[PDB]
């Protein structure tokens, strides 16, 4: 038979309360501002599906970002924009300022607000124990609060986490894989990039929800705990499951399949092999030590989970010793 279907634990039916017009995105119409407002200083990077700038807005002397798009559907962009507007204003989402067109090349860009970011490649290295604890708790706010409005991020990772650290200013990024969130609903699993895809997209389960972002998160704490980048480290989607197995163990991976009646790729068979669940500890050295504490480990347990359903929810995450000093400063 086919797989056992999964219901989110939390927050499952916030999109079926709402009218019709907050999740469905197709229909949305792209409200434009003028492109002329804007100025572009300098080039900040590439992708395969936009080129980003600094620019300018001239009629406030305003930095902004610049996300000019490649060609893309455009019920993905209304996807994009549709997230950004329900989530604006929202704790540590990054603002969508405007959305405007190249009126001769009909090219769409939309414009955020500027954080002065420090590469993850230079400040992860020079984060202390209660930087790392302070700016997990500050995702986990973005992240409580885009699934309490019924939105997966499906992309969380270093390079979609601006860190203006002089100002310890956090905001999550990049909402153009995002999703609402319908029980019932099948998802594609071809999402996040490669090191922070968890075991339901690799073992192909489409009925996943908010709990993904759980395991994205965990990956990216034992990455900064550990100071091992990327901490799950698979040469493609087949390894990248060994590489987890060989951390967490084949026997609760099968019990997982199991569970769900999952029917695994063939070619999983004669690489997965048997493997025991392997303490913390083996990843903790005199030069990491100081970053890892009983509740760092205690709390990246708890999130990286096979099961989704098991993995703590953002709030039983932000609940957990590893914060109760940040809460207690925020205080
Ligand atoms: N939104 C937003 C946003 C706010 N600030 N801020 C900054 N600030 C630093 C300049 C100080 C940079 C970027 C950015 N830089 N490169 N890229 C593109 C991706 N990059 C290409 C080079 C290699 C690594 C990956 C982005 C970006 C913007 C928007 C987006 O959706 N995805 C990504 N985005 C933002």
Known sequence: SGPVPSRARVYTDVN???????????????????????????????????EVFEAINITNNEKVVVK???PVKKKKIKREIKILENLRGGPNIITLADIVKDPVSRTPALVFEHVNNTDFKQL???????????????????????????????????????????????????????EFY???????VRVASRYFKGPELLVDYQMYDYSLDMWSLGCMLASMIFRKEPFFHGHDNYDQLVRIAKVLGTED?????DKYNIELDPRFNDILGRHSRKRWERFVHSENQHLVSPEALDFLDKLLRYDHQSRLTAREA???????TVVKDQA
């Open 182 to 188: 319908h029980p019932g609903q099948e998802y594609n």
């Open 124 to 178: 992860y290295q020079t984060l202390t124990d209660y930087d790392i604890r302070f700016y997990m708790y500050e995702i986990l706010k973005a992240l409580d609060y885009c699934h309490s409005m019924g939105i997966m991020h499906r992309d969380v990772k270093p390079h979609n986490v601006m860190i203006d650290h002089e100002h310890r200013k956090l905001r999550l990024i990049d909402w153009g894989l995002a």
């Open 253 to 257: 991976l099968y019990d997982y399949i």
């Open 16 to 50: 079926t309360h709402r009218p019709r017009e907050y999740w469905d995105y197709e229909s949305h119409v792209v409200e434009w501002g003028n492109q002329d407002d804007y100025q572009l200083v300098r080039k900040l990077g590439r992708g395969k599906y936009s």
């Open 318 to 324: 932000m609940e957990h010793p590893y914060f109760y």
């Open 68 to 70: 000019i798009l490649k």
